[PDB]
């Protein structure tokens, strides 16, 4: 039950350097390895033995130690480095290791990007299955902070709504999704529905109407 | 390293997984939690286990079939996690205090050569301290990760609906089309496009969990607008927990 404590969040500027610390529970008897976890991917070993790089690890990733405190340094921060990082160490002849609390790295100074918003009304197939789901897809924005509101005839809607937290796309920009689950009767009981996406002092609103084909 | 086994195990039951290959360990991660070591086993069969879990943990290996096994008994919702098959490198390193030297570094190879000696050569029958141990363990390679849900609820396959583009939802040269994967359980659902040939502009979203206890997600691809009238786009939904594969062609709306 060795305690390897990391800062929960660290931020650095694009192209600059950043450090993620891994401090011990209190005689550092084991070496520290580091790991990179990008959602949707399996973990990636970066550093082992305090300072040795693994295979395919760029040179900007570097490790160092200072008595019970191991540091992962990323010298030239890139946008693809935004990820979760975990240190680890084995504290005995036991074939066991302990992982650090983890650090979520934020890369600032990336190009801001207004969101694109796509609003799909319920498909004819789903409507014929006696269901109606409005699907609001939000893509290609940075930073990854949006609030999503739904409207029915310009009246707010809070029930039957589900929204996903923004996550990175393959191009290092963010995307989010929101759903409005209705009954077919409710779908026709209004003249229009809107998805409103607020992002950095800007609101993009897309609208669909049961009386007009998408 | 191929994680195989059920994606759903009922409470109180014993989860059992296997990792086909051709020193292996297991790591897991519960949602919003740090990585958690589980155990490993080398060619000599020796086993090590996370002390807090060794009661329920059981790991085996068939060098014959090249298959390592994990068995976690009496599972609870606390064992809901992604389970990773790994490869481990372990190497204990021995060092002597500053000045002190190993017997073999002084030239002595009799009994006690691997201990540290303050007085080198000079009547080696001197003060002898055991060498200090520093342990180095790290995961070499990671498996893709099998998601194991722990719940009494029953498996349910997904219903897939098309997210078709229309004349007003285009973005000039580009257009969005997708698939809505509704009401499945448990996670995960994997989505590809055109059986893996279409990978650019594709984004598959994380799933939402509805008040019904069921999951839903969407996958979208940005394609050229001009090609829509004749191009064929198919989303491939795979839900291994129900052994369900659904391919759905997404056509543009006639409006």
Author numbering:
A (entry chain L): 1 to 9, 11 to 95, 95A, 95B, 96 to 106, 106A, 107 to 212
B (entry chain H): 4 to 25, 33 to 82, 82A, 82B, 82C, 83 to 262
The paper states:
The cow antibody repertoire contains a unique subset (~10%) of antibodies possessing ultralong CDRH3s, which can reach lengths between 50 to 70 amino acids. The unique CDRH3 structure can be separated into two microdomains where the antigen-binding disulfide-bound “knob” sits on top of a long b-ribbon “stalk” and can bind to both surface and receded epitopes. BnAbs from cow-485 were named Bess, while bnAbs from cow-488 were named ElsE and assigned numbers based on their order of discovery.
Ultralong bovine CDRH3 knob regions fold with 3 short β-strands connected by 2 loops (Loop1, Loop2) of varying lengths that can adopt a multitude of different secondary structures, including loops, helices and β-turns. The ElsE series of Fabs all have highly similar knob structures as expected from their high sequence similarity. Flexibility in the stalk is evident in a comparison of the ElsE family of structures that have similar CDRH3 knob sequences and structures, but very different orientations of knob domains with respect to the body of the Fab. The ability of the knobs to twist and rotate with respect to the body of the Fab likely enhances the ability of bovine Fabs to access recessed epitopes. Low sulfate occupancy or flexibility in the CDRH3 knob region may explain the lack of electron density for these groups. The ElsE lineage was the most potent and broad overall.
